[PDB]
Design a protein around this motif. Sequence first.
Motif, mmCIF file in Angstrom:
data_model
loop_
_atom_site.group_PDB
_atom_site.id
_atom_site.type_symbol
_atom_site.label_atom_id
_atom_site.label_comp_id
_atom_site.label_asym_id
_atom_site.label_seq_id
_atom_site.Cartn_x
_atom_site.Cartn_y
_atom_site.Cartn_z
ATOM 1 N N UNK A 169 6.324 -43.047 -21.923
ATOM 2 C CA UNK A 169 5.958 -41.589 -21.900
ATOM 3 C C UNK A 169 4.359 -41.544 -22.399
ATOM 4 N N UNK A 170 4.092 -41.705 -23.647
ATOM 5 C CA UNK A 170 3.174 -41.362 -24.377
ATOM 6 C C UNK A 170 1.469 -41.567 -23.596
ATOM 7 N N UNK A 175 1.559 -40.223 -19.601
ATOM 8 C CA UNK A 175 1.074 -38.703 -19.696
ATOM 9 C C UNK A 175 -0.490 -38.733 -19.510
ATOM 10 N N UNK A 221 -1.370 -39.934 -15.842
ATOM 11 C CA UNK A 221 -1.628 -39.014 -14.744
ATOM 12 C C UNK A 221 -2.160 -37.362 -14.946
ATOM 13 N N UNK A 266 15.328 -39.961 -36.514
ATOM 14 C CA UNK A 266 14.749 -41.085 -36.016
ATOM 15 C C UNK A 266 14.177 -40.578 -34.661
ATOM 16 N N UNK A 280 3.204 -29.701 -18.293
ATOM 17 C CA UNK A 280 3.844 -30.597 -18.369
ATOM 18 C C UNK A 280 3.452 -31.856 -19.357
ATOM 19 N N UNK A 281 2.121 -32.136 -19.385
ATOM 20 C CA UNK A 281 2.145 -32.951 -20.885
ATOM 21 C C UNK A 281 2.684 -32.375 -21.897
ATOM 22 N N UNK A 284 6.702 -32.277 -22.022
ATOM 23 C CA UNK A 284 7.078 -33.472 -21.823
ATOM 24 C C UNK A 284 7.211 -34.349 -23.069
ATOM 25 N N UNK A 285 6.244 -34.346 -23.640
ATOM 26 C CA UNK A 285 5.851 -34.827 -25.215
ATOM 27 C C UNK A 285 7.089 -34.115 -25.786
ATOM 28 N N UNK A 325 10.898 -35.267 -24.798
ATOM 29 C CA UNK A 325 11.421 -36.731 -25.423
ATOM 30 C C UNK A 325 11.224 -36.641 -26.898
ATOM 31 N N UNK A 352 15.394 -37.569 -27.949
ATOM 32 C CA UNK A 352 15.533 -38.929 -28.584
ATOM 33 C C UNK A 352 16.905 -38.856 -29.460
#
Lengths: 49, 175, 243, 13
Positions: A34-35, A38, A41, C142, D1-2, D5-6, D9, D13
């Motif tokens: 993910x990180x 990001x 893109x 977590x 979205x950046x 989306x961060x 997740x 999680x």
Amino acid sequence: DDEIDVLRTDRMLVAQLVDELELHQVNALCLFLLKKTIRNKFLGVKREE
Amino acid sequence: THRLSKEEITIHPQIYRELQEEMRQRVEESRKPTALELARENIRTRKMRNRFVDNLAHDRFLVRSFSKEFSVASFRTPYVDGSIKLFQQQIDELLGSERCSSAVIKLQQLIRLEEIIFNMRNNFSNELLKLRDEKERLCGTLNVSLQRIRAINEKLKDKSFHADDVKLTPEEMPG
Amino acid sequence: TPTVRAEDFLLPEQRQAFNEECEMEIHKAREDDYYSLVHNEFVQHTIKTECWDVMEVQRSKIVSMTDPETEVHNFHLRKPCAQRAKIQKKIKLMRAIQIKTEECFTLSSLVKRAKEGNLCTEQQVCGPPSDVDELLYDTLDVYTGPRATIQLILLECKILHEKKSFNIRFDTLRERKSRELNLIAERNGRCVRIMQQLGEHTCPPNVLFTPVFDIEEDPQTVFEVFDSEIDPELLKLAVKSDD
Amino acid sequence: EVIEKVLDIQNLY
């Protein structure tokens, strides 16, 4: 042999718990994906603009 | 330029056939002491593999990026023939119970689970290997390019930084 | 005639060429078979090292008396890279510290605990509780990479506890059936002697109890050459040896 | 979205 086969069953009983763990590994793996995807893109969209 | 060579000059075919029988006798004489312990050597080796490793379709090599920021190990894909034989033996257990009477489909479900797992991680292994071959060709190109880089560096006397060759770690090449 | 031979039909150059060629064949066959043996042993050493010696806890095995083909093994362990033990000890101590520290930003405030009757299909652990049975995280705290890695190693310590408790009871079963198999062998010898004294020499194999040592139960037995596996013609060749 | 989306997740999680 009774003890042996019950132990074989307990092997399954323990191993069922094992499946949880590599799942957590993939959890951390996907967040790491993910990180930086990001930013990849986002900068792609940057230079397209 | 016109003669018969070493083998053409040999004697008439029946005579020579007798010679090949005697050939065979002395070749097997050489075989007899020396090709014997090879068999017991193979016995030892193969039955070690029987428990350990006699059943690998694909190798657990390691995968590294060129920047080497992470390392991933490939798959030790096994031969599932004995496994699927065991599943169909469970099928046969259920079918024998039915036949003695006068689950199975769930074991066939397990079976094609086994082959879909097998084939998906097989194709995963194949793309791993293809990336590795790309890596070795790229390693050759990198090697020669970085050699030219060091040549320019010393031409600049820029040993201060000369970009250096990088190859696959033996992690990636256990063979 | 039998006193006339293909050798006689030959010319001397053909004779010399054929003899030297077959003797070259002989020596090279001998030496190439010898190297065949040599790389056999070398491969055997490589196999032993990489498979067996790299493993910390070795691949011992059970086979039950009534089921000669069903096998039970203690679980695999590699020789530790020193990070293993260094981690284990340092993390357990500082993880007690982490229990008491109460520092980081917590997301669990939004959620209140509730109850579900069964949740997923059931799973269960065996033996005494682990330490990590007391030492796991919460479900919402977590959400960072390092904490996830610490959870990974907590689950690894769970792995260790389960593998151990399983394998200690496994080895206790090893010892029990060991003393039973020793006494069974003694009783089988006693029964054979009694039956031979009575005159009932044709003892069926079903009367004497099954001595089910699977060779993989003690896997180094599976290392060997079993000369029964040697080809019978090669066995006949080997009989003429004096040692 | 950046950003979202961060955050997604982070939450999932």
